[PDB]
Design a protein around this ligand. Sequence first.
Ligand SMILES: CC(C)(O)[C@@H]1CCN(c2cc(-n3ncc4ccc([C@]5(C#N)CC56CC6)cc43)ncn2)C1
Length: 260
Amino acid sequence: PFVEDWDLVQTLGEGAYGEVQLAVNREEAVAVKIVDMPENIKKEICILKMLNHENVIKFYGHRREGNIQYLFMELASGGSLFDRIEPDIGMPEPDAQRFFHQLMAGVVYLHGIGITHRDIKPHNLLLDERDNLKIADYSLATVFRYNNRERLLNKMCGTLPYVAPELLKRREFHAEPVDVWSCGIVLTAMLAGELPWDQPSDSCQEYSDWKEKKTYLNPWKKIDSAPLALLHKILVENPSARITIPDIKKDRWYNKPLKK
Ligand SMILES: CC(C)(O)[C@@H]1CCN(c2cc(-n3ncc4ccc([C@]5(C#N)CC56CC6)cc43)ncn2)C1
């Protein structure tokens, strides 16, 4: 089979709607999101067109073939952050810091254009030729600010180990602290090679242990005091008490010089 001049070589990953494939021309290699069948694809295309930043995946354009929609994006040659996390170990702290600084740069950019990602996790954080982080998958992205006016979110979505606790508890909630929370779980995964809990709920023992400051337990015991102090400010239950990105940028570990 062929679409204009493209050949489907390898499945790069799956999302809530459709599949992302590695497409080779006749010999340019690109990433194509193939979606069957409406209100959501019009929204995703719209958000994808607004994006212009070094830490956000580049959108090439879109083609329609009846019921099938093709979304063309720049191929992340370095693959995903997920495959740089050694299970039970994580990665060297200077590499985790650099990826965290790049994650903050991409999230400030999105929030600045009033877009919330809503599914930040290592499979959605890709790497270019020079290991520069790029935030991908905008199928769950939505507008939280328009005409300088904030809109609260009221839809439950994301990935349970990464979702903020207010998302499971409150009818309506602010967008930005939810994305901040998921960034904190990503930081935990980079420094410990393990996710801290199945979900941030009272029925989850590991979440209860964190709230009781049992930081002598895994994954926290694998993390050095300085990044752990940052995680203590991010992984705060009350979203109004949770650290904001301007203040993460002032954190001691965020500003620590690191090498080797
Ligand atoms: C062949 C090569 C160069 O060796 C490498 C081998 C692993 N590779 C990749 C590349 C990607 N890319 N690249 C661009 C791109 C855009 C969107 C998405 C996503 C969405 N939506 C997150 C999700 C669902 C996958 C992925 C993308 N995803 C994984 N691995 C490429």
